[PDB]
Amino acid sequence: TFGRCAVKSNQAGGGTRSHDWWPCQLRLDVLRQFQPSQNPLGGDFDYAEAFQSLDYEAVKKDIAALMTESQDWWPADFGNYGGLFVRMAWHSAGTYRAMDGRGGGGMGQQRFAPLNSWPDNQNLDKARRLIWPIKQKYGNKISWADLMLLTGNVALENMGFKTLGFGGGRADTWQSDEAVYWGAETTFVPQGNDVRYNNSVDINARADKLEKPLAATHMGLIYVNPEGPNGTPDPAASAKDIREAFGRMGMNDTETVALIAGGHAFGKTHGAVKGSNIGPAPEAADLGMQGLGWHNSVGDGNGPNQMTSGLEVIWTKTPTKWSNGYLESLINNNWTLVESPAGAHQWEAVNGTVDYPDPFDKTKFRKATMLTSDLALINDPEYLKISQRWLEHPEELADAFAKAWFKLLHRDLGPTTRYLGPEVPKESFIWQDPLPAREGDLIDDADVDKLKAAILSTDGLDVSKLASTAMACATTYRNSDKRGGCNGARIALEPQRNWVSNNPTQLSAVLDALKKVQSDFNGSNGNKKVSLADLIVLGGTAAVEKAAKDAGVDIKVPFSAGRVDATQEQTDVTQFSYLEPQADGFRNYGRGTARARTEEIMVDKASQLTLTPPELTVLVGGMRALGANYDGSDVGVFTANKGKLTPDFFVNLVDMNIAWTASGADGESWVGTDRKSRSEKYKGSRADLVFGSHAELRAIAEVYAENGNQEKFVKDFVAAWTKVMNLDRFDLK
Amino acid sequence: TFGRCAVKSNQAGGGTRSHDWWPCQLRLDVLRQFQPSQNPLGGDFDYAEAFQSLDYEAVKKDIAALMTESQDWWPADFGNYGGLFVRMAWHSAGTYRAMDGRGGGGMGQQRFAPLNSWPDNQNLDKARRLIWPIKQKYGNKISWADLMLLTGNVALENMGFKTLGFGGGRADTWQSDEAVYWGAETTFVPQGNDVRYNNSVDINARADKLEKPLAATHMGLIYVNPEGPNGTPDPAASAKDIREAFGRMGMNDTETVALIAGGHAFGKTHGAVKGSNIGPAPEAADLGMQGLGWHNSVGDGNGPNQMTSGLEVIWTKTPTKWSNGYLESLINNNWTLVESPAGAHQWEAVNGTVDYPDPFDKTKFRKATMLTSDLALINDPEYLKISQRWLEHPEELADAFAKAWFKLLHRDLGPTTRYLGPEVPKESFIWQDPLPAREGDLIDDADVDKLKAAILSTDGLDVSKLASTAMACATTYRNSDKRGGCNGARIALEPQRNWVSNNPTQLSAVLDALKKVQSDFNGSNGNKKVSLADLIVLGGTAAVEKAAKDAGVDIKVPFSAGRVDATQEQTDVTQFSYLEPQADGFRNYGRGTARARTEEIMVDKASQLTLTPPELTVLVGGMRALGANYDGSDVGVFTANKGKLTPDFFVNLVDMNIAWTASGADGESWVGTDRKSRSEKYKGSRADLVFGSHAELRAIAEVYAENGNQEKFVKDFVAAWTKVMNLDRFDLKV
Numbered sequence A: 001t002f003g004r005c006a007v008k009s010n011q012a013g014g015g016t017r018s019h020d021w022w023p024c025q026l027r028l029d030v031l032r033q034f035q036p037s038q039n040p041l042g043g044d045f046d047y048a049e050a051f052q053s054l055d056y057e058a059v060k061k062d063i064a065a066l067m068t069e070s071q072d073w074w075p076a077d078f079g080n081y082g083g084l085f086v087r088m089a090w091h092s093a094g095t096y097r098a099m100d101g102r103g104g105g106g107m108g109q110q111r112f113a114p115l116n117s118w119p120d121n122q123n124l125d126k127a128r129r130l131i132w133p134i135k136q137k138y139g140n141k142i143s144w145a146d147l148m149l150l151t152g153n154v155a156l157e158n159m160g161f162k163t164l165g166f167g168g169g170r171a172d173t174w175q176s177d178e179a180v181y182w183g184a185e186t187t188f189v190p191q192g193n194d195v196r197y198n199n200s201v202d203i204n205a206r207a208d209k210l211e212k213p214l215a216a217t218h219m220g221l222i223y224v225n226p227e228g229p230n231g232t233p234d235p236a237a238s239a240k241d242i243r244e245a246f247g248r249m250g251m252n253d254t255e256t257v258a259l260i261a262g263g264h265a266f267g268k269t270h271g272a273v274k275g276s277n278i279g280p281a282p283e284a285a286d287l288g289m290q291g292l293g294w295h296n297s298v299g300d301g302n303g304p305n306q307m308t309s310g311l312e313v314i315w316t317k318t319p320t321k322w323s324n325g326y327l328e329s330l331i332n333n334n335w336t337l338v339e340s341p342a343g344a345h346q347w348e349a350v351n352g353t354v355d356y357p358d359p360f361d362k363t364k365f366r367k368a369t370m371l372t373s374d375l376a377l378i379n380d381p382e383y384l385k386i387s388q389r390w391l392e393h394p395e396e397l398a399d400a401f402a403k404a405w406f407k408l409l410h411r412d413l414g415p416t417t418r419y420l421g422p423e424v425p426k427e428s429f430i431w432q433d434p435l436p437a438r439e440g441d442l443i444d445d446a447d448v449d450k451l452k453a454a455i456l457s458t459d460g461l462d463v464s465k466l467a468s469t470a471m472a473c474a475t476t477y478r479n480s481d482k483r484g485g486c487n488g489a490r491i492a493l494e495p496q497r498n499w500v501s502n503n504p505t506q507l508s509a510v511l512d513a514l515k516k517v518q519s520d521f522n523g524s525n526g527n528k529k530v531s532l533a534d535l536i537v538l539g540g541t542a543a544v545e546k547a548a549k550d551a552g553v554d555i556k557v558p559f560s561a562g563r564v565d566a567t568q569e570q571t572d573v574t575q576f577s578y579l580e581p582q583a584d585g586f587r588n589y590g591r592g593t594a595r596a597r598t599e600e601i602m603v604d605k606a607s608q609l610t611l612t613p614p615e616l617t618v619l620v621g622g623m624r625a626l627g628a629n630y631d632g633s634d635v636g637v638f639t640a641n642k643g644k645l646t647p648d649f650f651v652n653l654v655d656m657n658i659a660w661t662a663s664g665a666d667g668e669s670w671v672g673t674d675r676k677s678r679s680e681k682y683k684g685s686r687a688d689l690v691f692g693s694h695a696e697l698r699a700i701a702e703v704y705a706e707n708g709n710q711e712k713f714v715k716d717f718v719a720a721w722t723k724v725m726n727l728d729r730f731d732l733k
Numbered sequence B: 001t002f003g004r005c006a007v008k009s010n011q012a013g014g015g016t017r018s019h020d021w022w023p024c025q026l027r028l029d030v031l032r033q034f035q036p037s038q039n040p041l042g043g044d045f046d047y048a049e050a051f052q053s054l055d056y057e058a059v060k061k062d063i064a065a066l067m068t069e070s071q072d073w074w075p076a077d078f079g080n081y082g083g084l085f086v087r088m089a090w091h092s093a094g095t096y097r098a099m100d101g102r103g104g105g106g107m108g109q110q111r112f113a114p115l116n117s118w119p120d121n122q123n124l125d126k127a128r129r130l131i132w133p134i135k136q137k138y139g140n141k142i143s144w145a146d147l148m149l150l151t152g153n154v155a156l157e158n159m160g161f162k163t164l165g166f167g168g169g170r171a172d173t174w175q176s177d178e179a180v181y182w183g184a185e186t187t188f189v190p191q192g193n194d195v196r197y198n199n200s201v202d203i204n205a206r207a208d209k210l211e212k213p214l215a216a217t218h219m220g221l222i223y224v225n226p227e228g229p230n231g232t233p234d235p236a237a238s239a240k241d242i243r244e245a246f247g248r249m250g251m252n253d254t255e256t257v258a259l260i261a262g263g264h265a266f267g268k269t270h271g272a273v274k275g276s277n278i279g280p281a282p283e284a285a286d287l288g289m290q291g292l293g294w295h296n297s298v299g300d301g302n303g304p305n306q307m308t309s310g311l312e313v314i315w316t317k318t319p320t321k322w323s324n325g326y327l328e329s330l331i332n333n334n335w336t337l338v339e340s341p342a343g344a345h346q347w348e349a350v351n352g353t354v355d356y357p358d359p360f361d362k363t364k365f366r367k368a369t370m371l372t373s374d375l376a377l378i379n380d381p382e383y384l385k386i387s388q389r390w391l392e393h394p395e396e397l398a399d400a401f402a403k404a405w406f407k408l409l410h411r412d413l414g415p416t417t418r419y420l421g422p423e424v425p426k427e428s429f430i431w432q433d434p435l436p437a438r439e440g441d442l443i444d445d446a447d448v449d450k451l452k453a454a455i456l457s458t459d460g461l462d463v464s465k466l467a468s469t470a471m472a473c474a475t476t477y478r479n480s481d482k483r484g485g486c487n488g489a490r491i492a493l494e495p496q497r498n499w500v501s502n503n504p505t506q507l508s509a510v511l512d513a514l515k516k517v518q519s520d521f522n523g524s525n526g527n528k529k530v531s532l533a534d535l536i537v538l539g540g541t542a543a544v545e546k547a548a549k550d551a552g553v554d555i556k557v558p559f560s561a562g563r564v565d566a567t568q569e570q571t572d573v574t575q576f577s578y579l580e581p582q583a584d585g586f587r588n589y590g591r592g593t594a595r596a597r598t599e600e601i602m603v604d605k606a607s608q609l610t611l612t613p614p615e616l617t618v619l620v621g622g623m624r625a626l627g628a629n630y631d632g633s634d635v636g637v638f639t640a641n642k643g644k645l646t647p648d649f650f651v652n653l654v655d656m657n658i659a660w661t662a663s664g665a666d667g668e669s670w671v672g673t674d675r676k677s678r679s680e681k682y683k684g685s686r687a688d689l690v691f692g693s694h695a696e697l698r699a700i701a702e703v704y705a706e707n708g709n710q711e712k713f714v715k716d717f718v719a720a721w722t723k724v725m726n727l728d729r730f731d732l733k734v
């Protein structure tokens, strides 16, 4: 019954489906998302151009104005929506996970399932509805993704906290991103965590054993449970969860305290009535609710009766104005465990001052309150030291919060060249994976011709090695947070240069050779200078062009110059460790895990490269024809003409005279035996054989194996190659 | 456990998904299938042009050669793959359901999940693999879809049965079609039918009560259970299932007997070993099986050990040659209930001649055998009569089978204009929804302009009625079997002219007016003559152009002339009754039911029109702005400028000063109240309000509600309108 509707529809996809019958079969769904035809703006819409015509200052003025314009259907606390909007922006950005690069605010996914209906996003449907008139006014020139985050940024500034600035540039998306692994639990918070803790309920011991790559302690939360681990009001244990979850989001102790203390300077929580008065979340609500949810049946369901988290906490005596009241209260008050009106665990200063304002009655006041997760910051040795320091030096908190908030909002925006608008901060931050300005003058087509010829006749280089090295550098790209790719030549830097998947001894030889080509050019062409990054890509691109020529297809393989070389200082080894692949199908590297088969990892990577199923397929077949395995092995190299760009991989894979059988106990190695001669002809991996097994992939393999499609194979390969090589080229108009 | 993998992947979409949390929510998946980017051949690939250059006669010669080239990994019965190939083609075409027009061979879906792994398609994985070398040889110039069916047709002809011919033209598809309702059961045959019989197990009584629109008696079967209903070997009850299932596939008694007796002239069934020796179906098999499944562990798992259905029946004494041996055996033997080697029910003539050949030993023979489903044909009064007649007059069987086989293979290919190749049958058949040749010279641009002006100045025609009538005509199109659309002007004929969803009183007046425009033009413009079909579409098109102009936008609204007018004799009432909508979101007609909500019907219809979510959304919004409801109501007409092409529907739908509340008990009617003034402002349906509720549809509604997107709205509406009006224009070169 979980995951099943009581009524079984017989239209619009209703009925038992293929994935119901064979739920373990590989699915290509993630390669069919975000298709141009599904984008109502058109596949060629240029968001950056639209945003640059925007009257940016006017937009912020209108956002600031709205914050104190209370709407009767959801009245503003203290006459100011600032706190609500800060929470909106924080939750949009706060799903980010540094290791796999998923979540974050960069696609505006809060407006779709499942995030629109996660328990932790309760009543943010109201927040999004409040800013819709600004979206309506400025139309396509500001995206929902940008607007949600800008609104929080403007809210901070119009409550007295000056930020570092802001960058736009997040293009909207148009369907739910069903590629994200949020977890395998079949419940939400307050449950939703048996799997991610492997059934452990030892809250201290389990804290640092949260399932990778997850960054929240329950399904449906942003980071942690405000009532403590599994609702246990133990601040010390909560601190361990906080460190774990924020750490998984790429934040350290100082950033973590800064974000929590900075954030909870503002607004309040809502727990005025018990949960049984609350209707279905937006995805489960009736048509009349028109995209909203959590309808509250008590009174008008809003204002004094607001119910969001079940807690009723006001952190400071001025919830609409920046202060040091959070840390002053946290440290100077004595705290007692009490119940909120909705029955949740929170803390109160029962003998403290009665001067915390009521959000709808200026004559009424309350005592100081805190969450268990707030008390965490003084019930951990390291957090306590930071809290103590900043109590005395609030300007240090302000500095750290400005920096951490900027990071939170922009971590997944990608390279600096993507950041739009007139107040992009000038400081270059390590988490932006920064790139320098170019050296010298840009190479032209004559220089490219000369360089191709040199590269293809240089000691230590050949077609196989060049193609492999270029693809290895390219596939670090991931579209979720726009990290990685060939720009920067980071394969030449730590940690990539010593990744086992890069065959470091071969790689050093390849890079030394390309550096020699670079030195020869840069010492002798006036002010023209070429980057190693461009040479890596140009080398692989020249290799592909020659391989095509050798296969009997004359094609001009495009090349876009202008990449620059990152420094090691700009390339944090821990940050880049997150891009290291477990397996890579393009170069026949690696093995799957207990939770993910080799071919599943390949489809996941393909989705991160924005590839369609035909693009994935053509690239694998071509890489095999080129002999481009990471180790130079013959696994999957089903051709007698290694280095020629033929569709032999496909032709031989589907040759029924070859019988395929398991060799390794682990399911990863396969042998292809000629059924006539009974001799072993080939060795294959799961990345190879999936193309002859999965019915949709095999349909594509057949196309390339068909007589007459040799030129088509080359044209398609070259298109896909170009696309992959240029994924990070946001510097190009 | 059902529908859940034991290992929970954390890659490639692994993890709990939105549809798991909210499984009753409307899904737009069916509007995101078959997108050009997913097609390895490219969006601009023209299969018709590729097929035109095909060496068709050479393909048939190669298929014929293959039939007797036995491959050691799947040895041919009697040294001839003919029977297997006929079954392959029959199963490819045999999933068709007349009521919704889904299934059939026209998309080549047998090669994808779920059809590649249905129990009834066991070992057709081998059949498809056998023909791959021909596909490899001819490349893009013949589709898998055409090849599977052509192979069956060529197999018949080489085994001595001359067919009527064949038409190509089925472009391949590239992903599983997850829009088809094959049933709600969570099991396959031998189970897979509790839902479709509403838990009835009375096999004779329930036979005519099969859940609509289904056309098989268990999930995973083509039509019926060869062992009898629920595996009960009763031929009389089997006959009632056969009538029901084939009737649901658009075949009558004569056609049914012809196909069954015609098909079972050839080959044999396979039931040599117990099912326990058979491994996973293709979608569940390991990588080494390379797309095949049902691996049989006895011996080499093939030849004498073949196990497909569990039955071991050879119908005739010459299974590789056309004969009347099937009806002779059926009627002239006495039958006793026996068990096959796999333990399944079948029938044998235990006193009969021992002269039915063994498939791998030319010296060994067996007695005659039949399936329970074969005995059905002499255990029903009507079938028995046809059977006895054709025993005596096998030439009548031959004629009926040629016609029924041609129909089976081509029923979902659409208009005759789509049929390709050198042996397209010359006879025009009713199930092809035939159209006449055009009358007169084709109207030109100047004529079109003159006709638009005449239409718009004709009493009784206005923008709302013209747009409504054109869309009512167009949305009969369904891409699954390529039926319906504006060509033919069938809205003027029975049954469409009487559809309550077409507002027959109003429609009659609109058509009379268009007929006046036609009369005035035809005979006053030399040899140029215009059809009523073109006038209906041109009228709507003129209306849209006028509505745009009245909204301040001068836009070309393209028009493609050349439609013809069908006759009533070319327009079958039964066939066309299957296109009658129960709800229509474009014109705010009708409603859904428990199992198909109003908005679900709309999305299903959109899928059949090949619409994307933005295209569906823009069309609904524009129809409302035009006041184009079927009955001229104001339901959903959220505009003070009805008849002007504006995005008002969206603007007003998302206006937070309007509060929406249910008016009726069934959740189909909604009232929109101005929160300040407290007055009722609007009435809305579920088709209206879903665009402000569903998060993905609302995201699109917002685009068209945004200040600055007015011109974009008009451009997108006109593009979508043009698309829908032209869906059936296979006569025009792409």
Ligand SMILES: [O-]
Residues within 6 Å of the ligand: A087, A090
């Ligand atoms: O929060």
Ligand SMILES: [O-]
Residues within 6 Å of the ligand: B087, B090
């Ligand atoms: O069959």
